[PDB]
Scaffold this active site. Structure first.
Site, mmCIF file in Angstrom:
data_model
loop_
_atom_site.group_PDB
_atom_site.id
_atom_site.type_symbol
_atom_site.label_atom_id
_atom_site.label_comp_id
_atom_site.label_asym_id
_atom_site.label_seq_id
_atom_site.Cartn_x
_atom_site.Cartn_y
_atom_site.Cartn_z
ATOM 1 C CB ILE A 203 -1.068 0.022 1.133
ATOM 2 C CG1 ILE A 203 -0.407 -0.014 2.530
ATOM 3 C CG2 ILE A 203 -2.062 -1.133 0.932
ATOM 4 C CD1 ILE A 203 -1.279 0.495 3.657
ATOM 5 N N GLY A 204 2.141 1.151 0.202
ATOM 6 C CA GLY A 204 3.055 2.290 0.128
ATOM 7 C C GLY A 204 4.512 1.898 0.116
ATOM 8 C CB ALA B 139 13.203 7.312 2.585
ATOM 9 C CB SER B 140 8.903 5.623 5.590
ATOM 10 O OG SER B 140 8.159 4.967 6.605
ATOM 11 N N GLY B 141 10.415 2.897 4.249
ATOM 12 C CA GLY B 141 10.260 1.449 4.065
ATOM 13 C C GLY B 141 8.990 1.125 3.290
ATOM 14 C CB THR B 142 7.819 -1.836 1.570
ATOM 15 O OG1 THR B 142 8.941 -1.550 0.729
ATOM 16 C CG2 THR B 142 6.621 -2.214 0.698
ATOM 17 C CB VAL B 143 3.312 0.479 4.343
ATOM 18 C CG1 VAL B 143 2.215 0.206 5.370
ATOM 19 C CG2 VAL B 143 4.314 1.454 4.921
ATOM 20 C CG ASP C 8 4.363 15.014 13.443
ATOM 21 O OD1 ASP C 8 3.905 16.160 13.207
ATOM 22 O OD2 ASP C 8 4.978 14.340 12.587
#
Length: 293
Positions: free
Chosen positions: A28-29, A32-36, A141
């Site tokens: 689904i995404g 740089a955060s990684g793969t979701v 945040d």
């Protein structure tokens, strides 16, 4: 050290490969955060969200260890549930509760919320915040992007990658981690802020629910932060359209004087929250926003 990071993670995680517990992986995404992914728990049938990160390219890994440890020990109905984690070589998997209704941002950008619906969302968010603050956790945040919604109208806070754990010895923080448009003015004007930065951010989120954007969105984030510090409490475009009780609630969230600003516990008693509709009232907005994408 990279080796100590790995040994710490090894202690935290469940053993073996995540594919022994989870099945229908769908991406689904990616960034740089990684793969979701979304996936299904083989045993319970539960739909879950799984973050896959390569640690060799994760630059601030202390943050991931903090995030998991905080989430593990601060479970709450109004927080997206941390379920499990696995480490395979350099590859970390973090398994979370999945909410299929997207984010509050989708809702505020695609639909028009009424006051009863806004009050319900504010209440649920303040429930998460009161719990976290009573546990000496500041989210830091808070913004519509970090509020995920269930198809049933459940409202849950996500993303603990920026949270702070405070103590009586060190009850205030100074690090600027928050998203500029949602940042309390004291984060920039002083070097000592506390839990009420999350209350300010919630106030800005209520502005999103009314107007569809936080104040100064169209400005460079650098300029927004100067404007926040110098303008203080933001002005609404059409305050006359809002009920007196909603205006009062907003005033208490967006108070310049930190001492005067509402705590989460105090704001849970506010009469604005008493006009809340059932959470089910959000379902048509969620459906509409999901369709619009």
């Amino acid at each position: 050290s990279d080796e100590e990071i790995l040994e710490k993670l090894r202690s935290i995680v469940s053993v073996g490969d995540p594919k022994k517990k989870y099945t229908r992986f769908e991406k689904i995404g990616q960034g740089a955060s990684g793969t979701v992914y979304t996936a299904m728990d083989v045993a319970t049938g539960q739909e879950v969200a799984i973050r896959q990160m390569n640690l060799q390219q994760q630059p601030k890994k202390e943050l991931i260890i903090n995030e998991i440890l905080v989430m593990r020990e601060n479970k709450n109905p109004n927080i997206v549930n941390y379920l499990d984690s696995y480490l395979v070589g350099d590859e970390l998997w973090v398994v979370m509760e999945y909410l299929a209704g997207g984010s509050l941002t989708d809702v505020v950008t695609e639909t028009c919320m009424d006051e009863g619906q806004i009050a319900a969302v504010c209440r649920e968010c303040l429930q998460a915040l009161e719990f976290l603050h009573s546990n000496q956790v500041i989210h830091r945040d808070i913004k519509s992007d970090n509020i995920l919604l269930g198809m049933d109208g459940s409202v849950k806070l996500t993303d603990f990658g920026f949270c702070a754990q405070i103590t009586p010895e060190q009850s205030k923080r100074s690090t600027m981690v928050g998203t500029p448009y949602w940042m309390a003015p004291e984060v920039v004007t002083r070097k000592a802020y506390g839990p009420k930065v999350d209350i300010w951010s919630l106030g800005i989120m209520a502005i999103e629910m009314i107007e569809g954007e936080p104040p100064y969105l169209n400005e460079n984030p650098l300029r927004a932060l100067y404007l926040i510090a110098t303008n203080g409490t933001p002005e609404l475009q059409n305050p006359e359209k809002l009920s007196a009780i909603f205006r009062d609630f907003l005033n208490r969230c967006l108070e310049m004087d930190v001492e005067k600003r509402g705590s989460a516990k105090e704001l849970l008693q506010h009469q604005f929250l008493k006009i809340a509709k059932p959470l089910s009232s959000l379902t048509p907005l969620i459906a509409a926003a999901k369709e619009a994408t």
